[PDB]
Amino acid sequence: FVREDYLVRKLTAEELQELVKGERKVPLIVDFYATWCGPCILMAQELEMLAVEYESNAMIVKVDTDDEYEFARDMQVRGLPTLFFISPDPSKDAIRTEGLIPLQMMRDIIDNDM
Amino acid sequence: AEHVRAPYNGKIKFNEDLVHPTRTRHGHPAFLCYIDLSVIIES
Amino acid sequence: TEDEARRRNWIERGWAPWEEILTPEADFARKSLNEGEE
Amino acid sequence: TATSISLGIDDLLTIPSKGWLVQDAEQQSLILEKHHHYGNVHAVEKLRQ
Amino acid sequence: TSTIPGFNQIQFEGFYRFIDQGLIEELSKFPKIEDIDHEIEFQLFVETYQLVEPLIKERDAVYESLTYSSELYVSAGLIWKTNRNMQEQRIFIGNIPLMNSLGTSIVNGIYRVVINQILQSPGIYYQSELSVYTGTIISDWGGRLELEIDKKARIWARVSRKQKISILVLSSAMGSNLREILENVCYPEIFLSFLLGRIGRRNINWRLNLNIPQNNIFLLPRDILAAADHLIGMKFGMGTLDDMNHLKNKRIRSVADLLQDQLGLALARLENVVKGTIGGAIRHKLIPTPQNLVTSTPLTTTYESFFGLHPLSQVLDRTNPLTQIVHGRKLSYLGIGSLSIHARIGDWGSLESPFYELVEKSKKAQIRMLFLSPSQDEYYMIAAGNSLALNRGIQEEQVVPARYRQEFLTIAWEEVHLRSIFPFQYFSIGASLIPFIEHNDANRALMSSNMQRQAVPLSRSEKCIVGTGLERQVALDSGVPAIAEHEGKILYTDTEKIILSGNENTLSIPLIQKPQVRRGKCIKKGQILADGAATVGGELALGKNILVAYMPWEGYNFEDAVLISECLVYGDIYTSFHIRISQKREIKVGDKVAGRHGNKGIISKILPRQDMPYLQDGRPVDMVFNPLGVPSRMNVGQIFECSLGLAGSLLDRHYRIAPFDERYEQEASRKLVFSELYEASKQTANPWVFEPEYPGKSRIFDGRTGDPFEQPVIIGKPYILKLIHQRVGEMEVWALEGFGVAHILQEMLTYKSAPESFRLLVRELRSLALELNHFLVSEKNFQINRKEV
């Protein structure tokens, strides 16, 4: 076996609707990157580090807005790098963050707001 | 071949009828001379 | 044979001596270079 | 030892008119390249320039 | 494409190709084997080929002095008679040596690397001998075939110096008649007037514009007909001669092709071993399938003799992390040079380099990097210029220096096809590690490479203040640092091991290094865990940043001798460990040091700290180079490295200057250096660092006097590397006898080792049945005394 080089998992918009409708044990982080975007090179590395640091205690996934542009617009995304933190409790409001937020702000949100 | 180079800024002056027209090794037009030619430089 | 090949160029290869309009430096080249290098 | 023969980036000393001379040789070459495209100058003359 | 390739990838992709096809390819050529009585038959069922993993791990094989190898098994049919006299046993065919990931094979305990071989590419070539138009097919077996015209055509094919036949006669022997020649050649009345492997097929098709299908791997007669037709073309001048020495006409054989050849030899030996054992089975009966009629000897001993003896299998130069990489990228004509940083061996054995493509408006390309061999890249206008020129015209018509065919020329961007965008594209690894290389005479680029390949790893290695950014690539690909194999949180770290936990699974990584991770760190898969010898922070760290002045001292730095401070002995700064037991080798008089710029020198003098020259900040300099070396070897780049290293020492900045920064801007390197010198000055309030009167130089003081040397001395903190460490000749005989000093000559040639060697001379001639007889004549008595010989 050779261990896969990346942990942040790309989803389609429908696979994301499935993942949000189904019950979750852990916070879901959704990254709306796009591959032409400069800051997304950095955000992808921050999210890879977050995805290692939290192991199975967070579900970190990404959605390329080249593919799911209308879904990004319906998510009220107004730019990239953008990130949703969706609580496992479905009553709570999700948090959208915009720009390269620090990895410590990601940890803060995941530990204290989700 | 030695190159003669202008020692001063100014206006070249000479009677160009004393010298034969030619095409240089570089395709530039030039004059080819077989005399002692005096060239003025009005600096 | 020059003239037979001239005819063969005209008839088969489609040759004609289309006159070339030259800038005076290109004409000077196309004349002076007939006489020698320098 | 009492002196020193140390070399620095501005101890080297490009001849001041080099820029003009290069500009000269550049402008002629550009003009010849232009005239080579025009078919006034053949490839051997351009090479030799 | 997007990034500098892994340096070992050329080996890696070669070895994987050998596994991915070379095994099938070579096993498929194993024939059915028939006995002498035509009744018993043996064959390998190649479809069952099975490499079982090495049962011994690398670190055990190297310790036990063994070969780290996978075991090949194949099922083998053997019909001992008709009907059920059949066995189809799975048999062990033998050990194939496996590559370790950094590109080396452990063979009998010693790391070996297979050097790449350069050969003349298969195909067809035309030489103008003396005019004697001479065609030559090269098959990929190295077999020549020659064609020639000297006058009036009458093309001969040549087989030997006494064997030439007209090509219509050869074609008749190949079964092609004059009607086929007439139909299949462009100039048939000229012909009538006379009355290879996959790479070879490709190159002959390309060079002759033929369209023979690839499945016709061998030479066809129509290939020779086309070669003669093109030779008539050359005779008329309807073509070009080919230059054999040019890099475009070379191919590279990697580890893949040599290992595959050695599998071919091993299987041909297996064929002889099966034939001989079937013989013993057909004469002594013996036992069927004892394992089978196969021994392990052919493969195992073929590969181990390849590694032991073949000139292209060489012990890994484990001297330092750079040489471990560079060795596996050598390119030898025997069986030299090294592959450029971005070079890739293509699927046809050509060496390909990446070029950005300027397709403008029509096409919708996805990836705009081509990879092109020197055969292709001459038919493109490659520019190396920049788009940073504008005029009352337009950017498209702005001209740049480009390369087309083998020529250099100036063309508009509108004409440019490709751009050579990567800085390191043409450099070897050693050349890429030299900052400001464009300011060093390229003659020394090889030498300055060699210097780094002689640098001893130092205890307390240290990152260079000025670099190029390839120290990272070298550290990563050397495999001397412990790279993580799996993501996770760190659990434990000491001198013996690192421990990871991730994906809720643990991994233990023993160190054979110092841990860079804190025990609380979290690690992504391929990040560094521990630095190796001569790495720091995952950068190559072959040397130390030594405070240096360039001034001629009182001869102890005569012609690149070097003075060092005693502090270099105090600080263990150049203390190495040499293992035999180990010895703590300090730096000594007569040790060799070099900068990366080819500024080598030998330590002649060690002075105490207060005898050194000292700066206006009071610090004594730690070495004194001599400046006459700088124009001797023409290396102005080191003065930049000096000055900017000083800046980096004072600003606490490292610098990673990619080559040819002058492409941005003229004087760009001077601007960087002077800018950072001025920043270091004004931030530290050290106005002597940037003296505007003579920037980069400063006045410095004699530690034995306190007076300043009256002219400013160039100062720096360059990166200095410590390097690794009786015939009486005929020209000495000529010199001694020139001095007439002939009793010394007699001593040196006789009793220091008639003389016994003249006894040998006479005895061997006497053994050739010639009497070399020595007489001397008495001056007194004329007696012919025979010498003792």
Contact (CB<8Å) D32/B27: yes
Strands E528-531 and E522-523: unpaired
Distances (CA, A) of E441 to B11, D10, E593, E638, E662: 42, 18, 20, 12, 16
Q: How far apart are CA B34 and CA E281, in angstroms?
A: 101
Contact D38 C26 (CB under 8 A): yes
Angle formed at CA E425 by CA E422 and CA E431, multiple of 5 degrees: 120
Query: Mutate which of D35, D37, D40 to disrupt the C interface (most C C-beta within 10 Å)?
Result: D40
Q: How far is C15 from chain D (nearest CA, A)?
A: 21
Amino acid at E173: A
Residues of B within an 8 Å Cβ radius of C:
22-25, 27, 29, 32
Contact C29 D41 (CB under 8 A): yes
Compute the half-sphere exposure of residue E564: CA atoms within 13 Å on the CB side of its CA. Answer: 25
B25 touches chain D (CB under 8 A): yes
Is residue E610 within 8 angstroms of chain D, CB to CB?
A: no
- C27 φ/ψ angles, rounded to the nearest 5 degrees: -65, -45
User: Is A40 considered catalytic here?
Assistant: yes
- What residues pair up with E508 in beta bridges, in sequence order? E499
CA E124 to chain centre: 28
Cβ-defined contact of E674 to D1 (cutoff 8 Å): no
Contact between chains at E640 and D7 (C-beta distance less than 8 A)? no
Q: Which residues of E493-525 are buried (b: 16+ CB within 10 A; e: fewer)?
A: beeeebbbbbbeeebebebebbbbbeeeebbbb
Q: Which of A5, A114, A98 is nearest to A59 (CA)?
A: A114
> Which residue in the set A49, A55, A56 is minimally distant from E524, CB to CB?
A49
Q: Tell me the resolution in Å.
A: 3.5
Choose from D7, D14, D27, D44 for mutation: most chain E CBs within 10 A: D7
Q: Show which subunits contact E, needing at least 3 CB pairs below 8 angstroms.
A: A, D
User: Is E788's Cβ below 8 Å from some Cβ in D?
Assistant: no
Residue E621: which of E701, E722, E683, E736 has the closest Cα?
Answer: E701
Q: Which amino acid is at E69?
A: S
E692 touches D at CB < 8 Å: no
Residues of chain D with C-beta less than 8 angstroms from the C-beta of E550: 6-7
List the catalytic residue out of A8, A29, A30, A40: A40
Asked if B43 and B10 count as a contact pair (C-beta separation under 8 A), the reply is yes
C-alpha distance from E631 to closest chain D C-alpha (Å) = 9
Does E621 reach chain D within 8 Å, measured CB to CB?
no
The residue among E551, E543, E544 whose CA lies nearest residue E715 is E551
Nearest C-alpha of chain A: how many angstroms from E504? 8
Chains in contact with A, where contact means 3 or more Cβ–Cβ distances below 8 Å, are E
8 A C-beta contact, residue E498 and residue E512: no
Q: Which residues of E touch A44 (CB under 8 A)?
A: none
Q: Across the interface, do B26 and D35 touch by the CB < 8 Å criterion?
A: no
Q: Would you list the DSSP string of E238-287?
A: SS----TTSGGGEEEE-HHHHHHHHHHHHHHHHHHHHHHHHHHHHHS---
Which of D2, D7, D29 is facing E714, going by the closest CB pair? D7
CB within 8 Å of E210: residues ≥ 6 apart: E204, E222, E223, E226
Is C26 within 8 Å of D39 when comparing Cβ atoms?
Answer: yes
Write down which chains contact chain C via at least 3 CB pairs under 8 A.
B, D
* E365/E357 Cα distance (integer angstroms): 9
Nearest by CB to D1, from E554, E640, E696: name it.
Answer: E554
Which chains sit next to B, with 3 or more Cβ pairs under 8 A? C, D
Other Cβ atoms closer than 10 A to A67: 15
Query: Are C26 and D40 in contact (CB < 8 Å)?
Result: yes
Q: How far apart are CA D43 and CA E158, in angstroms?
A: 39
Q: How far apart are CA E69 and CA E106, in angstroms?
A: 8
Catalytic residue from among A7, A26, A34, A37: A37
Asked whether E147 and E155 are in contact (CB, 8 A), the reply is yes
CA atoms within 13 A on the CB side of C23: 9
Residue in the structure block whose two tokens are 């006995």 = E35
What residues of chain C lie within 8 A of the CB of D35, using their CB? 25
Q: With an 8 Å Cβ cutoff, is A5 touching chain E? A: yes
Residues E754 and E762: beta-carbon distance below 8 Å: yes
- Smallest CA–CA distance from B24 into chain D, residue: D45
- E693 interfaces chain D, CB cutoff of 8 Å: no
- Clarify whether A53 is annotated catalytic: no
* Optimal mutation site among E3, E367, E524, interface A, most CBs of chain A within 10 A: E524
Report the 10 Å Cβ neighbour count for A82. Answer: 23
Q: Which residue has the tokens 């064609």?
A: E147
Interchain contact D41–C (C-beta under 8 A): yes
Those residues with Cβ within 8 angstroms of residue E95's Cβ, 6 or more apart along the chain or in another chain: E67, E69, E70, E71, E72, E296, E299, E300, E303
Q: Does any CB of chain B come closer than 8 Å to the CB of residue D42?
A: yes
- Residue pair A26/A59 in contact (Cβ under 8 Å)? The answer is yes
- Contact between B5 and B35 under an 8 Å Cβ cutoff? The reply is no
Experimental method: cryo-EM
Contact A8, A47 (CB under 8 A): yes
Q: Which of E658, E646, E677 shows the shortest CA–CA distance to E465? A: E646
Which distant-in-sequence residues (6+ apart) come within 8 Å of A34 by Cβ?
Answer: A40, A64, A65, A66, A80
Q: Minimal Cα distance from D41: which residue of B? A: B27
Chains C and D in direct contact, meaning 3 or more beta-carbon pairs closer than 8 angstroms: yes
Report CB contact under 8 Å: E636, D2: no
Residue of C nearest to D32 (CA): C25
Each as own residue / partner, the long-range contacts of residues A67-75 (CB below 8 Å, 24 or more positions apart, any chain) are A67/A12, A67/A13, A68/A12, A68/A13, A71/A13, A71/A16, A72/A32, A75/A32
Q: Which residues pair with E114 in a beta bridge?
A: E313
Provide the phi-psi class of E709: left if phi over 0, else alpha when psi is between -120 and 50, else beta: beta
Maximum pairwise Cα distance, chain A: 41
Closest residue to A55, CB basis, from E486, E504, E523: E504
DSSP codes joined into one string, A69-109:
HHHHHHTT--SSSEEEEE-SSTTSPPEEEES---HHHHHHH
CA–CA dist E232, E228 (Å, integer): 6
Identify the closest residue of chain D to E669 by CA–CA distance: D9
E261: left (phi over 0), alpha (psi -120 to 50) or beta: alpha
Q: Cβ contact (<8 Å) for D40 and C25?
A: yes
Tokens 């160039």 belong to: E714
Question: Is D18's Cβ below 8 Å from some Cβ in C?
Answer: no
